[PDB]
Design a protein around this ligand. Structure first.
Ligand SMILES: [Mg+2]
Ligand SMILES: [Mg+2]
Ligand SMILES: [Mg+2]
Ligand SMILES: [Mg+2]
Ligand SMILES: [Mg+2]
Ligand SMILES: [Mg+2]
Ligand SMILES: [Mg+2]
Ligand SMILES: [Mg+2]
Ligand SMILES: [Mg+2]
Ligand SMILES: [Mg+2]
Ligand SMILES: [Zn+2]
Lengths: 142, 185, 187, 141, 55, 100, 62
RNA sequence: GAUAACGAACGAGACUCUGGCAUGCUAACUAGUUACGCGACCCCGGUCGGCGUAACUUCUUAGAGGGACAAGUGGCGUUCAGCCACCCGAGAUUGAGCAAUAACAGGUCUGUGAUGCCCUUAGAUGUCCGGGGCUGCACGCGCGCUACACUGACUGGCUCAGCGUGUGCCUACCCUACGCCGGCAGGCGCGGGUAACCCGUUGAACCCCAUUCGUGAUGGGGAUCGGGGAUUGCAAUUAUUCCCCAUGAACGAGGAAUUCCCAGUAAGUGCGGGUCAUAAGCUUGCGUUGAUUAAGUCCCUGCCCUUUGUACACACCGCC
């Protein structure tokens, strides 16, 4: 009676993308609907670099269900790429060997660090006497 | 598929860098290639961390200008993407060789300054930042108040810079930049 | 209660309860060594405590000038009959209360004593009490027509940082004269 | 396994429109030709049957989320007014062009307002609303 | 009759009706949270009320 | 036996000392209790000018006030609680009590 | 610029002068020890003091 | 570290707040996830925010504790204070608040029942009720808004936010779901909410995919000035705000001069509050789309120390 429930989160700005990993077939769906009818259709391969960097045999035996909360249209893409990457490494961590995890970690890292390291950047406040956070108003003499 | 990298159905290899001066400060190759020309950024907090951003990304980041374009990169990728289709079906070559040729043929070697002025030469990173700003502005003025998409402007401007047909604000501002610093060098 | 009032209005209606109770008890118990209140709400009692010095002279004729305040404050905030009680307790370590020393200054000044005398008559008292430093500052017109701000400082005194909240004390009192107005800042 | 959710929900209304055209029991109102659909639009609809499209869009917002869409149909179909002074607020939709529609879709049997307000749908209409999706799915590759 | 003319304007509503509860002036009233007091005297009594400049 | 006792106040540490007092004496008197459930805090915002007049560079003050709220549910009779909501109550703290 | 102040310089020495045998070479060891050999109110001042202490026990062993 | 100086003080720093790190701790029918049984349907599935509850806290929430310090490794330097480079790691300059001695004839008596002197005080400069002005217009300057179009206007469709407020002392003035009548502004009945309990899971905007489109001021542009309908109020004339009459005007990327600005920053872009019966082209905050250049100098306009010179000390707006 397997209860192999691997719940992984991931953040961009306000993009709390939660992946999930069970055991069964190899398929991925987000908010129920699959990866095709996801948002901007100019951003298609950003869900395939977790596939295409490693391969499509690496995702054999793991099925995926993805929750999403918060954020804009792009951060809900950069949080659902990092999420399922950290859920692949965390499945090879907990349920199979720890040693074949290191090649997969190395290949994902030798392409981009964003796959595993969140972005410690957010927006910034607005000081009094300016129309923004740094820009001051028009000063006129005479 | 070991590491083939469509740039939207293109290939990364078969790229040949002619000059020795622009050897490492221009990264358009194996390690420095991504299926798409987009990244999360964080390439200006250190000084020379910009010289590792692919020239495709730096074209994308420097295409959008003048107010009504600040914040549209997802949009301005698509112009490049149709631009390499048109170049592939009008010249019939690899356009990432065409573009590296246009950068070479478009980069300046000297500039004048104030010490009445006197002339010095230029850095390779200066030459990249200048050739990009030049030919991108020259594509925009030729697509301003003209029935021509900006892709077809960039296609012909990259062609007449890898050709030198004096149909280029990119080469045309090179003689005025050289002859001024030549009278007074 | 069915007035069904929110929470924010509640914490404000009692901040105003404390603020009117201090402005009214200050503008009237000034010469009698007044130093502030601290209210305590119970299951149907309210024990307001006047933190004065001369507790015998603030009751009047055997609790007379306090039993008057008992039916005044009821008729003001609309309390029930006997849900308030007034204790008038003395303040210990009398050297470190600012409005307590400023009233003794605005009546040593009114009684015609000179300024360099009474500044040392406060300052020696609050070096005697065992403190660290003081910044008694007096302004207003003095033996002329042009103004001039005096000052007396010894000890140790901090200005910046967060610890100005819970170390130091601050007091401001206007004092009147027939010719003009003098002002006092204590730190 | 096929439903509405694997069909790239843009031409699902370009065949549900033609199905509510072909069956054609929708009670188009009298005043169809002469309306603005908003207080921010500027022209009439370019398409000559602009009523069936909005009945298919409503029938899928209703398939997807909620039994409480009445003024949330105007909160989902507003836009951008242009006052000549500053960008205007997301303006509401139109109350009549959707009250008349949901009373016109109550003429056949696919909607049923029950409780906690709003109009929800029936499994009987869900049969029809789900069978042409596998049709488009296999016919589009 | 003057007892019928002495207050014969509606002073029901509008800011020409209200006033400060400390100074009784009619300019600059923080009507928020039921204060209804002038912003000068609000800055003066802010410490004892409980508002404080943390950031 | 459904009684909820709400503790709302400004002073964080003294409110914590009363909510842990009112739980340790329940636990030391053997009646089942839930946890010290923490609700999110509310804030207030007032932004005024730091000037009586209109003279000076335009500079603004600011003022805040945080507030916290906790609620505690029990399973007990409804007579010993008058004693329980009295052992070391602290000033500032506004305790609500609901038996219904 | 990370320049250690005189309030630090004055407390690194009296701690060395009184607990020279008890101190060591690792940062997180004397980082726990100065809490119970001294009344230091905060954490940042703790890590600054022990950070310069482990720079003197290296200069001394040199 | 050098030394006729030694020891102490405030100021800077230290501090409090906010911001990203914790699978470990604290807990949840007013927040949530995972399981099973309802259902409906597509041939195992998809479902919710329509239902029901069994375990739990990763996500949501706020409390305590740790956590990062130029610590490590090389390079440079009197081998002193430190600087550059590097590894390891969530971070190797986050953002504001508070703030010195001494002083200015800076501004405020139009915030005060804090106040000295002067004028007026019953034919009132006190007080109330009717009007009308503070909004007028040959010119001149300063702060801002929409724009001058194909990276673009017009119809569909598609899919994602975070800070907040909200039924009153005198107080009559709340946010509002959901049913209908109408083009639309709205109306008529109906219910909830003193608030993580409802409004609301706050289906927010360009951007996204399919539609029509000029070299002339074109469907770009939408202003002074022209016909009709509803709302607040005791009252809208000089038109209080919004839809439905139009002129469809100037404007073809801006002169000498000049402001602001270096990373979630400029700019684009919509929401909340404040003022408020009526109300945003101002302002105070929030989010989302997210760049180009630089890691340097004293030339310009200014500041900081040492030395120098002086006929100035109300101090170069000087004196003569
Ligand atoms: Mg262009
Ligand atoms: Mg317009
Ligand atoms: Mg909208
Ligand atoms: Mg000091
Ligand atoms: Mg200091
Ligand atoms: Mg003066
Ligand atoms: Mg006066
Ligand atoms: Mg001007
Ligand atoms: Mg024009
Ligand atoms: Mg300048
Ligand atoms: Zn006043």
């Amino acid at each position: 009676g397997p209860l192999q429930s691997v719940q992984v989160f991931g953040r961009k700005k306000t993009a709390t993308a939660v992946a999930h990993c069970k055991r069964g077939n190899g398929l991925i769906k987000v908010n129920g609907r699959p990866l095709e009818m996801i948002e901007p259709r100019t951003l298609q391969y950003k869900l395939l670099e977790p596939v295409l960097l490693l391969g499509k045999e690496r995702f054999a035996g793991v099925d995926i269900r993805v929750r999403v909360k918060g954020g804009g249209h792009v951060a809900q893409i950069y949080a659902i790429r990092q999420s399922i990457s950290k859920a692949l490494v965390a499945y090879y961590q907990k349920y199979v060997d720890e040693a074949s995890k290191k090649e997969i970690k190395d290949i994902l890292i030798q392409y981009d660090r964003t796959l595993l390291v969140a972005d410690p950047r957010r927006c910034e406040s607005k000081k009094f006497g300016g129309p923004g956070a740094r820009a001051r108003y028009q000063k006129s003499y005479r | 598929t070991p590491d083939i990298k469509l740039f939207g159905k293109w290939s990364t290899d078969d790229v040949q860098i002619n000059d020795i001066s622009l050897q490492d400060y221009i990264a358009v190759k194996e390690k420095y290639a991504k299926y798409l020309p987009h990244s999360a950024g964080r390439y200006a907090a250190k000084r020379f961390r910009k010289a590792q951003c692919p020239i495709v990304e730096r074209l994308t980041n420097s295409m959008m200008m003048h107010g009504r374009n600040n914040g549209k990169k997802l949009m301005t990728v698509r112009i490049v993407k149709h631009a390499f289709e048109i170049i592939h079906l009008l010249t019939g070559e690899n356009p990432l060789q065409v573009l590296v040729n246009a950068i070479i043929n478009s980069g300046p070697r000297e500039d004048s300054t104030r010490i009445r002025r006197q002339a010095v030469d230029v850095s390779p990173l200066r030459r990249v930042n200048q050739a990009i700003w030049l030919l991108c502005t020259g594509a925009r003025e030729a697509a301003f108040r003209n029935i021509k998409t900006i892709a077809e402007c960039l296609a012909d401007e990259l062609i007449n810079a890898a050709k030198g047909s004096s149909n280029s604000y990119a080469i045309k501002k090179k003689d005025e930049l050289e002859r001024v610093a030549k009278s007074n060098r | 209660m069915a007035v069904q009032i929110s929470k924010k209005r509640k914490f404000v209606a009692d901040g105003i309860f404390k603020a009117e109770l201090n402005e009214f008890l200050t503008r009237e118990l000034a010469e009698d060594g007044y130093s502030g209140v601290e209210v305590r709400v119970t299951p149907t009692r309210t024990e307001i405590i006047i933190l004065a010095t001369r507790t015998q002279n603030v009751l009047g004729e055997k609790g007379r000038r306090i039993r008057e305040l008992t039916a005044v404050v009821q008729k003001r905030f609309g309390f029930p009959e006997g849900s308030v009680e007034l204790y008038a307790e003395k303040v210990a370590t009398r050297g470190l209360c600012a409005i307590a020393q400023a009233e003794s200054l605005r009546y040593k000044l009114l009684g015609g004593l000179a300024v360099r005398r009474a500044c040392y008559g406060v300052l020696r008292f609050i070096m005697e009490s065992g403190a660290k430093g003081c910044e008694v500052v007096v302004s207003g017109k003095l033996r002329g027509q042009r103004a001039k701000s005096m000052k007396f400082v010894d000890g140790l005194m901090i200005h910046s940082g967060d610890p100005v909240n819970y170390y130091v004390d601050t007091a401001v009192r206007h004092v009147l004269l027939r010719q003009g107005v003098l002002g006092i800042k204590v730190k | 396994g096929v439903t509405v959710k694997d069909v790239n929900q843009q031409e699902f209304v370009r065949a549900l429109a033609a199905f509510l055209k072909k069956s054609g029991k929708l009670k188009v109102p009298e005043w169809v030709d002469t309306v603005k659909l908003a207080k921010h639009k500027e022209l009439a609809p370019y398409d000559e049957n602009w009523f069936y499209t909005r009945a298919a869009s409503t029938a899928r917002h209703l398939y997807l989320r909620g039994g409480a869409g009445v003024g949330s149909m105007t909160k989902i179909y507003g836009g951008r007014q242009r006052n000549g002074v500053m960008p205007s607020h997301f303006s509401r939709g139109s109350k009549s062009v959707a009250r008349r529609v949901l009373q016109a879709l109550e003429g056949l049997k696919m909607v049923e307002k029950d409780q906690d307000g709003g109009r929800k749908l029936t499994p009987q209409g869900q049969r029809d609303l789900d069978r042409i999706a596998g049709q488009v799915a296999a016919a589009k590759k | 009759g003057h007892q019928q003319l002495y207050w014969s304007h509606p002073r029901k509503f509008g800011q020409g009706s209200r006033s400060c509860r400390v100074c009784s002036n009619r300019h600059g009233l923080i009507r928020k949270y039921g204060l209804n007091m002038c912003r000068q005297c609000f800055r003066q009594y802010a410490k004892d009320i409980g508002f404080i400049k943390l950031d | 036996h459904r009684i909820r006792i709400t503790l709302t106040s400004r002073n964080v540490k003294s409110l914590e000392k009363v909510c842990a007092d009112l739980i340790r004496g329940a636990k030391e008197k053997n009646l089942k209790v839930k946890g010290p459930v923490r609700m999110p805090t509310k804030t207030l915002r007032i932004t005024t000018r730091k000037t009586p007049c209109g003279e000076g560079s335009k500079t603004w003050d600011r003022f805040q006030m945080r507030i916290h709220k906790r609620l505690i549910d029990l399973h007990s009779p409804s007579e010993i609680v008058k004693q329980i909501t009295s052992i070391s109550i602290e000033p500032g703290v506004e305790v609500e009590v609901t038996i219904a | 610029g990370r320049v250690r102040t005189k309030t630090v310089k004055k407390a690194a020495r009296v701690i060395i002068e009184k607990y020279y045998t008890r101190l060591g070479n690792d940062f997180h060891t004397n980082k726990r020890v100065c809490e119970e050999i001294a009344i230091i109110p905060s954490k940042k001042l703790r890590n600054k003091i022990a950070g310069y202490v482990t720079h003197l026990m290296k200069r001394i062993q040199r």
